[PDB]
Amino acid sequence: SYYQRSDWTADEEQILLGPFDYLESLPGKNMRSQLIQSFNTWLKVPTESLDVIIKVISMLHTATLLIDDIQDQSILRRGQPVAHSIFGTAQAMNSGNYVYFLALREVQKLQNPKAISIYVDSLIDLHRGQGMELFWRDSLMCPTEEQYLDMVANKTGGLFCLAIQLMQAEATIQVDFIPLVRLLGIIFQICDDYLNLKSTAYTDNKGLCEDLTEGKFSFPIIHSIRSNPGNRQLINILKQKPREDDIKRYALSYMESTNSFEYTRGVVRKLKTEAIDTIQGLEKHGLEENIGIRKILARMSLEL
Amino acid sequence: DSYYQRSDWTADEEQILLGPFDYLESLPGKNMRSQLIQSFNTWLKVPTESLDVIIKVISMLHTATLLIDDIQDQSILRRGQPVAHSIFGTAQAMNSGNYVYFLALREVQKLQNPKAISIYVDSLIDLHRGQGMELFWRDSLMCPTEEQYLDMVANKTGGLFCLAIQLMQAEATIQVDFIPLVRLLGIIFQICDDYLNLKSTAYTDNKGLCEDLTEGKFSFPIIHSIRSNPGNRQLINILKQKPREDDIKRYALSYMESTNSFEYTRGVVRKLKTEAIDTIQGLEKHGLEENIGIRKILARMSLEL
Amino acid sequence: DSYYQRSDWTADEEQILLGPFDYLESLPGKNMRSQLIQSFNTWLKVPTESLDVIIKVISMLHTATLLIDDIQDQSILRRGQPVAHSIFGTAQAMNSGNYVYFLALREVQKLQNPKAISIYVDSLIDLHRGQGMELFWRDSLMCPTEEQYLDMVANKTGGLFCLAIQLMQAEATIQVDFIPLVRLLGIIFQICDDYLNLKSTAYTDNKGLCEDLTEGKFSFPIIHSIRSNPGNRQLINILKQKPREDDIKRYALSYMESTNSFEYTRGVVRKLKTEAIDTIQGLEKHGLEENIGIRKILARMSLEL
Amino acid sequence: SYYQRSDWTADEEQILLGPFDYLESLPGKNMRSQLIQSFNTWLKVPTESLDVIIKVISMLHTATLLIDDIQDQSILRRGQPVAHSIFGTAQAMNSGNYVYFLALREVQKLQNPKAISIYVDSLIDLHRGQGMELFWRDSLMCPTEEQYLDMVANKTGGLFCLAIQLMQAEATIQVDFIPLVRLLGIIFQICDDYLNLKSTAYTDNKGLCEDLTEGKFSFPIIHSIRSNPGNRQLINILKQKPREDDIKRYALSYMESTNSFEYTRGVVRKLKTEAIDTIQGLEKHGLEENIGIRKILARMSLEL
Amino acid sequence: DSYYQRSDWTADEEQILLGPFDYLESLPGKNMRSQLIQSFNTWLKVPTESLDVIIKVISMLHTATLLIDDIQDQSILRRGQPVAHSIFGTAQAMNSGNYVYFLALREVQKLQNPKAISIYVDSLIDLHRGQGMELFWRDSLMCPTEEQYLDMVANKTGGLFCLAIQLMQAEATIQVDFIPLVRLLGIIFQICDDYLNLKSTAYTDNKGLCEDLTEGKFSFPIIHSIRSNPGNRQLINILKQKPREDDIKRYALSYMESTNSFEYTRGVVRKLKTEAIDTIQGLEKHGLEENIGIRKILARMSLEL
Amino acid sequence: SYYQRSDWTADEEQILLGPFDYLESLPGKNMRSQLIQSFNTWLKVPTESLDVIIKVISMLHTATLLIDDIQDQSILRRGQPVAHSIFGTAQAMNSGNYVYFLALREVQKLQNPKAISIYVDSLIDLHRGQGMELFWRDSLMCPTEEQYLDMVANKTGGLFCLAIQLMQAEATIQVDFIPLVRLLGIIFQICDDYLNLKSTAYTDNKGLCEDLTEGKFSFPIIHSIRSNPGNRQLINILKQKPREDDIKRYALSYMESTNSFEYTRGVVRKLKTEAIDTIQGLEKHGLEENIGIRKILARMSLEL
Ligand SMILES: C=C(C)CCOP(=O)(O)OP(=O)(O)O
Numbered sequence A, D, F: 001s002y003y004q005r006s007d008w009t010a011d012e013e014q015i016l017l018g019p020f021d022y023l024e025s026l027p028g029k030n031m032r033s034q035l036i037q038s039f040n041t042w043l044k045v046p047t048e049s050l051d052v053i054i055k056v057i058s059m060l061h062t063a064t065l066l067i068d069d070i071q072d073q074s075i076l077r078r079g080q081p082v083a084h085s086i087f088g089t090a091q092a093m094n095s096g097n098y099v100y101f102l103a104l105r106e107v108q109k110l111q112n113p114k115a116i117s118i119y120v121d122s123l124i125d126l127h128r129g130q131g132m133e134l135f136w137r138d139s140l141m142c143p144t145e146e147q148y149l150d151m152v153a154n155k156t157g158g159l160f161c162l163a164i165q166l167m168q169a170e171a172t173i174q175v176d177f178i179p180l181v182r183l184l185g186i187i188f189q190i191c192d193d194y195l196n197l198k199s200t201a202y203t204d205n206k207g208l209c210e211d212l213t214e215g216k217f218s219f220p221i222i223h224s225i226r227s228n229p230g231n232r233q234l235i236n237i238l239k240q241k242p243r244e245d246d247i248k249r250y251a252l253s254y255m256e257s258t259n260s261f262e263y264t265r266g267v268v269r270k271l272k273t274e275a276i277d278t279i280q281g282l283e284k285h286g287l288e289e290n291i292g293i294r295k296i297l298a299r300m301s302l303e304l
Numbered sequence B, C, E: 001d002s003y004y005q006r007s008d009w010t011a012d013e014e015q016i017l018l019g020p021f022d023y024l025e026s027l028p029g030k031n032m033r034s035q036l037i038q039s040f041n042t043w044l045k046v047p048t049e050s051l052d053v054i055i056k057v058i059s060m061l062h063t064a065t066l067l068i069d070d071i072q073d074q075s076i077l078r079r080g081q082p083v084a085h086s087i088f089g090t091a092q093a094m095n096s097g098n099y100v101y102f103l104a105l106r107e108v109q110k111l112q113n114p115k116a117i118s119i120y121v122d123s124l125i126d127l128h129r130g131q132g133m134e135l136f137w138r139d140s141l142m143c144p145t146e147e148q149y150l151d152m153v154a155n156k157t158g159g160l161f162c163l164a165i166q167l168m169q170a171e172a173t174i175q176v177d178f179i180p181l182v183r184l185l186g187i188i189f190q191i192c193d194d195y196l197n198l199k200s201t202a203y204t205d206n207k208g209l210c211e212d213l214t215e216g217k218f219s220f221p222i223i224h225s226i227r228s229n230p231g232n233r234q235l236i237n238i239l240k241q242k243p244r245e246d247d248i249k250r251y252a253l254s255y256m257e258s259t260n261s262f263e264y265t266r267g268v269v270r271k272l273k274t275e276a277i278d279t280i281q282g283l284e285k286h287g288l289e290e291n292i293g294i295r296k297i298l299a300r301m302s303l304e305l
């Protein structure tokens, strides 16, 4: 026989995962792990299953960062070069998408038919969020705040929800924790939008105001653009995708003149109050008091 | 009362997400994976309702793979028309393709077959393993051996051929193993494609002159030509240059003729076709009915070689 | 004794300043604004000495506007020859054009007409208002409505048509108002131009294939095609891409045929021509002599529609 | 009727003036206003007419900056991004040229036929100066100092002269103030050439030695090039339009080695002496002593 | 025992170093410097063994000079095929060419002629002096006079013509001075080349349409055209733009016809050929045998003028 | 006669040498001059001949820098702009290659037939070294350490050897000093490789880690790449030719994790011991003790 099939080797896997492993070697904050831990106080998934869920979520998170940095044309990630500036965009993109299917193979280890459907629905939502974000970015059409939050719910919220939905599929309690975790994912993204423009640690981690370089209609940027439609400086800056710090500093000063950062702090305050009220409701109906989830809520909105 | 109210996904939003995908589906193709499915169905006799799901799944995945491949290769034309990302941009075209990978998975679940998910995942894993090794060689400028190339092709082009027939086997009541045959057909198909990309007027019209050279790809005849004289480094350096210019590509093409790499490639395809026919005859001698359709697909895919 | 002595402007320096302008004037054009002036002069009978100043002013302004337009649109060809800034650079071509705007103003003063300056200024103001709105839509990727487009065209293309006839009226002894007619003729002229840019071999030779697409312009048929199916976003995304490639432009052209946008455009031009002829007949019925020349200009500018 | 003409709206005007209004929102030094005020001590134009003249000159100045920054491919203006790096070059250019005709409409408010001719002649001179400057820049041909001053007289001098010529057209005194104001405009431009290469505030406002990046044959650059024609480093640096600070610092050091900054200080000294002598002559022949115009002369040459 | 052991240079490494050089030598040329050598050998009768070394030295240097010239000029085609640096990159092509300059020097030493090294060095010095002045004018956008241009050509193109015949004279037993004649032939050859680059279909196929314009070169007819009307600056500004576009080049070509620069160039070539024939006849009248071959080379190099 | 040949003028020579003279006006360290002086203690070449040799070596050194900076696409040289960023690559390249033949004309002044052959052989070796270095760089194929040292012996070693071989051709002593000088040239290049990545003065002189920007397989880079072939981050960084300091700092940190700088220090130590042993051997066999050559050895490896 002319052709003889070879088994896949560890050396080849190491090539395929080159970009993924590079990113995993960079220290992150591990918010999603602490979120899983805080929900497990209530759901009490055993560690055998929980370890699979934690691995799945870490894999999907790192892979999504690989792809996001390419689609956004970012330069820094966790204060280090983005993976594709080392390995090129094609290998980094292929590595991220590969890991999406390695993670599905990992979910299959739960031997839980509902978990498969949960995974598919979440990967569908993730791409629906990325697709609408890109659509607005490329068309230079500023979404409303309500459209933006629906996109965030699909995107950033999709992974938060995936983690807790898999936990629920591995527990017999009949309480719906997803509205709460979706709310926490929305809070987390709005804080991220804010800190991208205001936090010095975020300047060290990704560059100054990198959402402006990337042309993104983020939460405070939307508010600023829509607060004065007759002034088109900020949306035109987005169009220009500026790498220059002078343009970005001018944009940041414009956004303070429209009070878009106080606006964003006030919305986060309102959503945190809803989150606390939801936690208190869950506990009033039979769940033990959960200190860890209050600490996660406080931590993600620590600034602001 | 909640500050945020989740909205349902709408048809208008789906139409945005599928903009690049719908664009590519509106361009007429050769629909050969459908003829392959039909020719194996002569033996497997999958019920119409399951077969329609498999055909849809394979069509979706094929188009989605084309969206992504054209981006990763920086192609210009697809089916003689602009590549989708030259209309929608690379980011939306890439996202649309990967989106469809998961819509197709949702479609696969309609078979309600406990084995179907693992089959799908194993195939998507193979597809990415093949693409990743091909990009690895391209970017490092390291020419694989022919054997390494065929293992990569088996993963890549073969992975979707194999997915179609593996789902059909999972849905059929007979237990014959058709996968070694279909993987061989996928390899033949890809080598023929490598040849036609460089030596076919129809492919020049559909994808540009010798576009594998522009993309820097170590394709089957290119590997042979590079390795037949390692002291001459013109061809591998042309690959490095990723030329869009027809003059460099015509020179490279003339060099590959000088190393007799197209004869070499035709001879390999002939040997593989002979193995394919022998395998088909073996399957028929052991019970299966004579399959004219699968011989036509084999004759069709190697027509110009 | 002064350290600095002011020198007089010289012919050699003027020749430098007008390098781009003289280049464009040496390229044969259709000289249709001169036929328009002549056809309205059948009615207005401006004395030869004043008419020569107006003809010169309008020629100067037209060429200068072309210098600037080709830069702002990033055009490549003009009258089948290189755009002036691809010889002299954008900065000198732009400065030469804006220079001529003020040389033409100096020429206008030779009419010694107290009203002529205001007429000139109002027209240059309209011209910049039209160009500014067109650039605004182009850069923001926001498709105007047809009504917004025509208001912009009325300012832009119409502003110079109107300037010619408004100066002629100011210099004539009759008080008939010809401006609504000439603004209508300017709109017809521009819509015909939008059509011919996409669907005329002579325009392909003079400015390139479908150059409005390369420039990203929301022209009359392009607006119709975009708005006829807002769920398909291929055409507006092609505009965003500013394609120089003929394959994308041919696809866009084929899409616009599929939305029936050229029939739509021909039908609009037919209605506007009917209004123009009715207005002409109204002017003649109320005293003015029958004007064959103005009917020929109307027939000429819409010939291929 | 198929087409109905719409009136121009305030929203559309706000679009057309987007780039102009952006620049006007950036604080300048207001030299031309203080120049007008110092000459009005002698010309005593009433405020109704003077307000029109001041508005016209401000409009033309800001519009000329919009266009100059595009033609020069500048990056900063008054320490902020150039207007075209926000709005793009086409809209910024159209906005500037639009304002040239809005300013002519403003001049018409004087109902002074001579003022129209003065405006046209000055806009003609302005473009003659810009055209010769660009011609030398693009052809890499170093003008003589005398050619450079003729160009400056047309360009920078054209607006100084416009302001005072409009004032003279609104006054009955029969004294010719234009030779003096032209001299002040030449002094102002030579100081500007110098400060572009030597002043730290100018480095903050436009970047380090931005005349080198722009390839301009400015007053000290001409002197340095011509002081040693056998050394072609500086003219070749101009050709390269360097954005790198290392090349610019090397060029600046070369220009000090040719004593081009002392040369420029000495010329400014000689011209200031002529300016003072001209002022004293005007006053000896019947005009009151003008302290303000001496302060303007001192201020524009304060450094140097 | 030493940590480092020096290895001998290998054939495989030489093959790498000469990759760009061997590529260019595999492309058929006109081999006119070989006909020139043969035609002067009718008079000089250099022994075969020395003549073979000179022929090899001149071939090596010519190809090496082409490698470098194509890089310095940013050329695209050479002998109708891709320039070597568009395959191997500029750095390896440049290094390979300069390498061969010193391999040729090693070859020259085989003549064992005490004068040969100085002759070689003086010629390489002249070659670089000519290239350096040509680049100086190109980069500074300063049009030389015709006399300055010819001095540069005498250094550049003439330097290798002169090297061949100077080595032949050094190896021959007669003392006749042929260098003024051969330098004149080198000048004629270069002016003809300048003309054919702009006005010859064979040169369009071998190097592209009017490639001297793309390269920004002040060639013989271009100098004439620029200087015949210094108030028109279109042509020198086109040189500045280094146009790859055929439309700009066709316009420039049409402008040069309008200044009658090709007639001017043909007339100059005619005068120089007349001087060359008179010099040849003078050499023959004073003893040398009638040389048909050198008249054929002269007729060949000016054939199309 | 239609054409009259002109003599070459000093003004034209000044044009041809523009880039060369620019580089010569920048202060270097003069290692090769001190090397020649230290060997002359033994060879005692008279100053008339030695002055020619010193001039030849200086010329070839400066010319090689001109060309290397172009082929490497460097940005800084001796802390100043590379010559081609002023004069353009074509004139700078032509000037360097011109000087190669001016130096050969200078060598002819020795009227020493062996000196001509020595010069040719060294220029041949120089190009053989540059050619193999470029071959590996462009093909992304990491040489072995032994291949790298053979290339260094041809390249950097070729000029060291040329200097001392010309000295030997002008002396009657029958001792072979070339193995020693070749060893010193190898030591010098390995120190240069190291200091390019580790010395702050080298950061000021050429930029941070400029060998990474240039894609060069230098001595410590080779060791790091080959120490872990399963990790391909560093070779992929070389492929990317990064101008970004973040990527370069990441690469530098990777190379410390593979101990490639300690490895390089240890090799230099071993070679210096061989150099000292070779010097001691030459002196044991009849040569006077040479303090200067020990100081040169100490100085070139001063760091490390
Ligand atoms: C936080 C988690 C789950 C792990 C680290 O990722 P990063 O901290 O770097 O990224 P974000 O969570 O801020 O998206």
Ligand SMILES: C=C(C)CCOP(=O)(O)OP(=O)(O)O
Pocket: B028, B029, B030, B031, B032, B033, B034, B062, B079
């Ligand atoms: C042939 C099939 C399955 C459908 C059309 O796709 P294409 O013809 O364009 O692409 P390939 O099958 O050649 O990969």
Ligand SMILES: C=C(C)CCOP(=O)(O)OP(=O)(O)O
Pocket: C028, C029, C030, C031, C032, C033, C034, C062, C079
């Ligand atoms: C027709 C006139 C007035 C003169 C020639 O200009 P062009 O023909 O080239 O340009 P348009 O009139 O079509 O705008």
Ligand SMILES: C=C(C)CCOP(=O)(O)OP(=O)(O)O
Pocket: D027, D028, D029, D030, D031, D032, D033, D061, D078, D192
């Ligand atoms: C000085 C005036 C008239 C107003 C501010 O303009 P700028 O100060 O910023 O610019 P220049 O006068 O220096 O040209």
Ligand SMILES: C=C(C)CCOP(=O)(O)OP(=O)(O)O
Pocket: E028, E029, E030, E031, E032, E033, E034, E062, E079
């Ligand atoms: C003519 C000779 C000496 C050999 C072929 O080289 P080319 O024909 O390609 O180049 P030129 O001689 O025209 O310079």
Ligand SMILES: C=C(C)CCOP(=O)(O)OP(=O)(O)O
Pocket: F027, F028, F029, F030, F031, F032, F033, F061, F078, F192
């Ligand atoms: C050292 C010598 C011979 C002279 C100065 O050159 P540089 O010091 O700048 O360059 P390298 O010797 O480090 O190569």
